[PDB]
Design a protein around this ligand. Structure first.
Ligand code: CA
Ligand code: NA
Length: 259
């Protein structure tokens, strides 16, 4: 069920952080769940601070919006920003003050792989427009794991590389002409990169698209609402066919429609 994005729905709040620690963060579900996890298993990370290690894990979506965690993982090293992703039983996150992506197997609590994203800017070089060290942004779509970033050679333009989920080797790389810092966030649907215009506006838009298949760039004007006017995280879940987002203490989801 692939196609081009033609519509985004109203934001739906599933849960709200009670502490300033959760001002921005990342929540997630596995698009390719494996034992002992299911499609309902939800992970949460409040990413405010310099010592971000705690990952809240919820077996049931019910626990996740109305209860306590079923488990809390302590990451081996501090985590950077809100770009993390869970895929096929592993948490993929960026080590604090680095351009290193770590593959953290959740069930075994083991580090299975680490790789330096070649030439990638980090720690405030090429963040999204709101800052927050969002230089490196992992993504999952119908084809698997990606990483969104930029380099000096790209002059801050969004670069996206297809990643091997086992060893984190770059399989292929595309260079866009979209300034990453000029955009609120980005995600990938069916091999097409999309960007959001603003992180504060209730009247923002999905304003750009870049297709890896054809290399064509396009301007869009699909409405997109930041209900709480501070979206720190915007990701696409290819299983639910939905956008997951974190907006000013609030854990939200958007419905979408594809051509
Ligand atoms: Ca994103
Ligand atoms: Na991400």
């Amino acid at each position: 069920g692939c196609g081009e994005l033609v519509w985004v729905g109203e934001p739906l709040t599933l849960r709200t952080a009670e502490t300033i620690t959760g001002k921005y963060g990342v929540w997630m579900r596995d698009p390719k769940p494996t034992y002992p996890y299911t499609q309902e298993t939800t992970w949460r990370i409040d990413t405010v601070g310099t010592d971000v290690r705690q990952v809240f894990e919820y077996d049931l979506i019910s626990q996740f919006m109305q209860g306590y965690p079923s488990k809390v993982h302590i990451l081996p090293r501090p985590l950077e920003s809100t770009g993390a992703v869970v895929y096929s039983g592993s948490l993929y996150f960026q080590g604090a003050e680095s351009r290193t992506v770590i593959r953290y197997e959740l069930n075994t609590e083991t580090v299975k792989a680490e790789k330096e994203i070649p030439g990638a800017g980090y720690h405030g070089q090429f963040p999204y427009s709101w800052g927050g060290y969002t230089d490196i942004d992992l993504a999952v779509d119908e084809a698997g794991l990606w990483v969104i970033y930029s380099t000096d050679d790209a002059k801050g333009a969004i670069v996206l590389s297809k990643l091997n989920p086992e060893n984190l080797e770059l399989e292929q790389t595309w260079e866009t002409n979209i300034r990453k810092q000029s955009v609120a966030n980005a995600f990938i649907i069916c091999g097409t990169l999309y960007t959001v215009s603003s992180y504060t506006s209730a009247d923002a838009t999905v304003n750009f698209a870049y297709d890896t298949g054809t290399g064509i760039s396009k301007t869009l004007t699909i409405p997109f609402k930041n209900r709480y006017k501070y979206s720190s995280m915007i990701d696409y879940n290819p299983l639910e066919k939905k956008l997951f987002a974190w907006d000013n203490l609030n854990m939200v989801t958007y419905d979408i429609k594809l051509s």
